[model samples]
Target: STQSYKDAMGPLVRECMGSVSATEDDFKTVLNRNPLESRTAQCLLACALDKVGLISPEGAIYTGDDLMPVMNRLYGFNDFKTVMKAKAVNDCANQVNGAYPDRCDLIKNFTDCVRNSY
Candidate 1:
């Protein structure tokens, strides 16, 4: 579980997006980047998701009891946990520079891993 990354969202975005607040448009720009395999696209989404607590430093999504809450009380979705949040940019390279050899590689690996798990 990426519990440790749960609160890192704010800081990551501020450093990456260059602001404390990000809107859907910002996320879309990242998503729409040509050749999604590029560095900016990869780093942006990876860092953003990690910042939002959806992913861990190990590139794992945070899913489980920690995500369960009053909203799931009705369906009792004890096994269902899904989330969506996105953004992009390479200027925040300093933020994730040392953790992984290549920010783009980090994003690709994380995405494939998360997809497989899904």
Candidate 2:
């Protein structure tokens, strides 16, 4: 499941990086270090998340029913991992609620929250 998720993410990351004019290193930094450091990286993440249905048009993170299917698709049928991933998404979405007016910032906050929670 983990490898499958990584494999799926690779193409999305590359696409988003090109869409946002972000470098490969920018993605590496955002995924491994801090998303807040680069606006392009944040936008790239927003693009990827939106493409995956994890973020809405209004920049809101999906949760509950909306998130479950997405996680299932990404991680396969491991009910336990899917539930936990959904919980993390729900928690992070709440934590970043209205915290930023910018969509990228909101995405960054949500991403940060989820990463830290794990």
Candidate 3:
């Protein structure tokens, strides 16, 4: 990548940054002190690179069990942050469904009704 690109796309870029508070120098020092490239942009780029050789995104679940119909609820469209949240939600549902399909929803709905009944 170009140094200018790296300079322009440093860690201080709030949108691309994972943390709420980070600066270009913080990113540069943390990343480039040893050529780490710890910026979110660089991290994403690395993911792309790994994907190119079929190392990453391979065997990636990338979606939920109800694949297709409700799969969108699990992945895609949303940005990285939103997607991670969605995946967590889907994963929770999956685990609950898997471990206690007959009881998890029952417990949740029962709790809801109990709360609303008051």
Q: Estimate each model's TM-score.
A: 0.37, 0.80, 0.24
In terms of TM-score, which candidate is stronger, 2 or 3?
A: 2
Two-way lDDT contest, 2 vs 3, winner = 2
- Which of candidates 1 and 3 is the stronger one according to lDDT? 1
Q: Write the per-residue lDDT of candidate 3 for residues 35-59, one digit (tens) a residue.
A: 3233433343333222222111332
State each model's CA lDDT, in order: 0.43, 0.75, 0.35
Question: Which candidate ranks first by TM-score, i.e. highest?
Answer: 2
The CA-based lDDT of model 1 is what?
A: 0.43
**Candidate 2 regions off by >4 Å?**
29-36
Candidate 3 lowest-lDDT run of ten:
52-61
lDDT, candidate 2, 6-110, per-residue tens? 565667877787678888777776544355567888887778778777876677788777887668667776567666767888988988867899888888788
- By summed lDDT, which 10 consecutive residues of candidate 1 come out lowest? 84-93
TM-score of 3: 0.24
Clashing pairs in 3: none
Ranking by lDDT: 2, 1, 3
Residue 99 of candidate 3: its Cα lDDT? Answer: 38
- Candidate ordering by TM-score (highest first): 2, 1, 3
